[PDB]
Design an enzyme around this catalytic site. Structure first.
Site, PDB file in Angstrom:
ATOM      1  CG  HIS A  90     -10.051  -3.393   2.455  1.00  0.00           C
ATOM      2  ND1 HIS A  90     -10.028  -3.606   1.094  1.00  0.00           N
ATOM      3  CD2 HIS A  90      -8.871  -3.867   2.926  1.00  0.00           C
ATOM      4  CE1 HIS A  90      -8.898  -4.203   0.761  1.00  0.00           C
ATOM      5  NE2 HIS A  90      -8.181  -4.375   1.855  1.00  0.00           N
ATOM      6  CG  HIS A 107      -5.815  -0.253   1.835  1.00  0.00           C
ATOM      7  ND1 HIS A 107      -4.654  -0.608   2.485  1.00  0.00           N
ATOM      8  CD2 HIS A 107      -6.574  -1.372   1.782  1.00  0.00           C
ATOM      9  CE1 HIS A 107      -4.706  -1.886   2.814  1.00  0.00           C
ATOM     10  NE2 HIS A 107      -5.862  -2.373   2.398  1.00  0.00           N
TER      11      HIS A 107
END
Lengths: 394, 150
Positions: free
Chosen positions: B72, B57
């Protein structure tokens, strides 16, 4: 076993734990202190990266609701992943200048410490992680511009280990005895010295409360400030410090003990500063205590040397850890000026606790640090607290 | 004047509005965040992929100019354990802005993530001269989101 499953619990109590878990949700066993670890020195991105290695592991965990609990010392395991990051910092320290090498070692030291957090006495992985932490801390000091001495002080047929951080050995220096909480190691505060005490030429002497870190061989008894008292007596024989200019800083439970010492040795202490200290409130609240996350109960059970836990029974004992329930607070006030602080909302340390402490202290003030940008609203306060001690020690 | 291209499509939000203190307080770095509308994360600049988290991620990247970026997806998304993400690029990979780094299942994420807000920040703030933040709607690999001067 695995960290989260070391504390033997009674079947009756293991159920309440189950209830509490499925009640908070939380995808972790341990209390993650992302911000705190960043202030102590961990790179914020490496930290997320470690948590990703831990959360993404498909190895068996003790409790799948806690990606935090992989069983076994291999990828995915907490100690293992933090140790990995520690070795990485340590390995690459092997090719840096000296100022840079030390900083990489200190950072290595911190990772090792986190790797063992919350440091349960029975955790063999956490224990060797602790050995790495100590070693890395020693090597970092060798390559530092500063002076870090590891002192050994005889006590109760045994010895107390304390670390003396000096900016230099020119003139004697006022020293501040520092102690953190039940889940910390005394070596987790290098930054408090490097970015706040060293700047004022103030010496820092860290110590672990009995049952914690280097002081884990000493049981956590009624008088849990005895070690600190013993260190105070040794000061008169340490040429680098001005044993006539002694200050105290305590974090979390460490702060409770510092207030204590501030009553027991008024004459030999100039000032005391506490942060996030659990004075009375939380101790006068068994509902809350038997509700807290399991990590915290595991910690108590460990410091108290319990063989089997009854979460209800323990909630009881804890009433004793109150300073009001002990006496220090009620009638007489200490001559020692004490500055008590904590964050707005701290469940463990309400302004009302920095309140009592401030009251029973001549020239003692209680000042809250509010949440508006926690990070900014701390460095500031923390800097005030230092100027305060710079004053009282001079 | 280097342009930072949107690593994913969405609406721009202040970095300090994300439900997480380390990001919101600009501890990881400074920049902006994006409310995702698409399905992939791509390099925001020409350079070298640094890290790629194992949960797929998030990633870091260093432009050939020396600016270090960190993208992020969402907040607390690490607890989804990689579910909903698919890794395309690799660590050390040389890439051009627009190159695909990760692909993600948005529907699944808007349902399981605490928040989908996606920080895109400069992690080495000390090594840059100035940062200007842009706003509005952005399309992955096209609309710039920040302008940095190393």
């Amino acid at each position: 076993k695995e960290t989260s499953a070391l504390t033997q619990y009674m079947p009756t109590s293991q159920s309440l734990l189950d209830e509490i878990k499925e009640k908070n949700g939380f995808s972790w066993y341990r209390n993650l202190r992302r911000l705190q670890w960043v202030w102590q020195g961990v790179d914020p991105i490496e930290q997320e990266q470690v948590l990703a290695r831990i959360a993404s592991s498909k190895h068996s965990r003790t409790d799948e609701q806690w990606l935090d609990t992989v069983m076994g010392y291999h990828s995915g395991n907490w100690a293992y992943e933090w140790t990995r990051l520690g070795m990485e910092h340590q390995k690459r320290a092997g090719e840096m200048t000296n100022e840079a090498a030390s900083e990489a070692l200190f950072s290595a030291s911190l990772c090792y410490s986190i790797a063992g957090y919350p440091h349960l006495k029975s955790d063999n992985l956490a224990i060797q992680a602790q050995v790495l932490a100590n070693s890395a801390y020693l090597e970092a000091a060798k390559k530092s511009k500063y002076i870090i001495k590891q002192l050994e002080i005889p006590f109760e047929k045994g010895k107390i280990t304390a670390h003396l951080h000096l900016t230099n050995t020119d003139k004697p220096h006022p020293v501040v005895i520092v102690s953190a909480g039940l889940d910390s190691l005394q070596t987790d505060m290098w930054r408090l010295f490097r970015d706040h005490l060293a700047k004022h030429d103030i010496a820092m002497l860290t110590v672990d409360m009995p049952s914690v870190g280097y002081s884990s061989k000493y049981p956590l008894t009624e008088d849990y400030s005895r070690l600190h008292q013993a260190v105070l007596n040794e000061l008169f024989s340490i040429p680098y410090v001005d044993h006539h200019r002694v200050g105290l800083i305590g974090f979390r439970f460490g702060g409770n003990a510092m207030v204590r010492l501030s009553f027991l040795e008024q004459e030999k202490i100039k000032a005391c500063v506490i942060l996030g200290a659990p004075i009375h409130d939380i101790f006068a609240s068994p509902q809350k205590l038997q509700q807290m996350p399991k990590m915290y109960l595991d910690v108590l059970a460990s410091r108290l040397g319990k063989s089997v836990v009854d979460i209800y029974s323990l909630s009881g004992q804890m009433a004793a850890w109150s300073l009001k329930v002990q006496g220090f607070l009620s009638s007489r006030k200490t001559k020692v000026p004490i500055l008590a602080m904590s964050l707005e909302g701290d469940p463990v340390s309400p302004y009302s606790d920095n309140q009592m402490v401030a009251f029973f202290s001549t020239y003692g003030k209680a000042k809250k640090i509010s949440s508006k940008t926690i990070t900014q609203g701390y460095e500031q306060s923390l800097d005030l607290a230092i100027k305060w001690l710079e004053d009282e020690l001079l | 004047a280097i342009e930072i291209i949107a690593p994913l499509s969405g609406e721009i939000v202040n970095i300090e509005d994300v439900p997480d203190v380390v990001f919101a307080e600009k501890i990881v770095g400074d920049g902006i965040a994006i409310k995702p509308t698409g399905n992939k994360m791509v390099a925001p600049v020409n350079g070298t992929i640094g890290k790629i988290f194992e949960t797929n991620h998030a990633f870091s990247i260093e432009s050939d100019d020396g600016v270090e970026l960190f993208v992020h997806f969402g907040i607390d998304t690490v607890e989804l354990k990689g579910e909903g993400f698919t890794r395309i690029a690799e660590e050390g990979q040389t890439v051009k802005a627009g190159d695909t780094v990760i692909e993600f299942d948005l529907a699944l994420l808007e349902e399981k993530a605490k928040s989908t807000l996606t920080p895109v920040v400069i992690s080495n703030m000390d090594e840059i001269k100035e940062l200007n933040k842009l706003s509005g709607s952005v399309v992955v690999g096209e609309t710039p989101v920040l302008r940095v001067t190393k």
